[model samples]
Target chain A: NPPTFSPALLVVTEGDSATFTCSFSSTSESFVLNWYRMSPSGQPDKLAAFPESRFRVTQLPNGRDFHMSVVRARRDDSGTYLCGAISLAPKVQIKESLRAELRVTERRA
Target chain B: LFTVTVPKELYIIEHGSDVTLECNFDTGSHVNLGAITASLQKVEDPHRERATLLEEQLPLGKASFHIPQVQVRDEGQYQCIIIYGVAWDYKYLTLKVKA
Candidate 1:
């Protein structure tokens, strides 16, 4: 079960918020949503567990939480990011989005 | 119920070099070999036949998938499958072969 991320290439400038949209058509309520980021250094880190304030997650009116935004992107924010939606209904399948590349450019000096 | 650990989310390798993909799992005190199975598969496409590199019953907590003389053509998404009893899980990574 692979989720989808809009805009394969996300461009954000320094101090700009980089928002990522991810969606997994999961009818199963036992599914979990997580955010993971791996910088150019190749080290992967768990950003958050879906609902967080540091890296904001957007929840829609119908209770759809598919947007993750990094507040004021920095240079180090440029890297490969992903949305992981792991379902427990089957407990045998895990859905993840393909790497969505983000490039944070410097603010005009 | 078990825990699966992925050493890395992405692996970069030099062409013609040996590469290893590792996965570790934990069920409980002393994993009964019969209770677990691990496999590594190369996913070239989002929807296509995956090339299975290795599959075996895990005798311990960790499974190391070693590929020798990796090629640029081998660069793609790799998946790790861990099955313990009725429950199973997956881990994924991209293998990039650098010059």
Candidate 2:
């Protein structure tokens, strides 16, 4: 079976102050999730790592939601954010985390 | 906010002095030192011969091209290229260096 993605996609708007959220209902008990920003030319920049709440991370806001936010939306803020998980059950297995594309445009007020 | 595309010729020059070239592409790419290279070219022949000109590589990831010492020879078309990763993309900068 595929280790990632159920048509994985996330959405956002310009000037979105709230954190972009991602959730997964996995049966695996030993998984550590991570996030990264990748370019079309194979360059990956670290946006935020999991478990680090200070990096604009919001967790379980009431029920079950994990989120992160971009302070401001510039033209250079559009790219692909990849969420990957490292499995630690039975054997060390890596699962392809979700891929989220953030589309930031000038907010029409 | 907009991507710029150019050919191996024609640099966007301003008025009769300021030779300004622009290169706007897919943003969010962290271009470090020595990551990309650019140059300007001038062709002076017809049969793909002669083509006498000068070329120089600029700073990496620069979005604009400016030549302060523009002479008569620098009055033709110029080409700017960014060679990074595994791709070499070029643009045409029309340098109409006028009086």
Candidate 3:
């Protein structure tokens, strides 16, 4: 089966917060969940891993749902975000959820 | 899920020869090659540090890290890191240089 993400698209005003969730079907003893931000030019780089504080990253005790949130949305923060998980068992495998396109508009003063 | 492929998992080349490590990934209609990030790093004893990132030729879903003149110290395991949105994958190449 394939992994999946919820709320494929999001639009928020600058200064607001944004969040995304990722879920998988397979069962693995251990997992590494990660988040990445896609650049305007199209490059996607690691944003944060689970257990991070700067940007909130949390995994449910069930081990199937992973969540990520940005403290404040800025113009530069406007881009596609992704949630990924790596299963370490039977063989190391990686799976990614569909992107969440984030568009941050300027807030009115 | 995204996967990176290396032509040669283990490469043996003579010292002083120019070498290029080839990396290729799937470019499905849903995937934008330009949106992917590629990185090359050499494994080390204590920790890995030597790193290089591809700037151009990324939109093609193919990239190569070149070594002008291979040296003895350059012989080691090199890991290629591929990132697309939240997906991250890696491919490795072990290089052995003979004088």
What's the chain B TM-score of candidate 3? 0.78
Model 3 clashing residue pairs (backbone)? A42-B35
Q: Taking the candidates in order, what DockQ does each have?
A: 0.08, 0.02, 0.06
lDDT for each residue of candidate 1 in B1-99, tens digit (9 for 90 to 100): 355668677789999998878777766577665656566666554323333334453565766677788877779876676656544555666788999
Q: Model 1, A1-109: lDDT tens per residue?
A: 5877767899989899999987766675544466778645543355754442458766556655478889879998888988766544433344668888999998897
Instruction: Write down the lDDT that model 3 would get.
Output: 0.66
lDDT-sorted candidate list, best first: 1, 3, 2
> Per-residue lDDT tens digits of candidate 3, residues A1-109?
3457767888889888887777765553334466777655434456777542447778778877777777788888877887766553432344456888888899998
TM-score of each: 0.53, 0.39, 0.51
Query: Is 1 or 3 the stronger prediction by DockQ?
Result: 1
| Model 3 residue A74 CA deviation in Å | 0.9
Off by over 4 Å in 3: A52-54, A87-93, B1-19, B22-79, B82-99
Q: Write the per-residue lDDT of candidate 2 for residues A1-109, one digit (tens) a residue.
A: 2233222444445656434664544564433344556656433344564453323545565523456566655556777765544433442233445566766666677
Question: Which structure among the candidates has the greatest DockQ?
Answer: 1
Candidate with top TM-score is 1
- Can you tell me the CAPRI class of model 1? incorrect
TM-score of chain A, model number 1: 0.82
- Model 1 pairs in collision: none
Provide the lDDT at A85 for model 2.
46
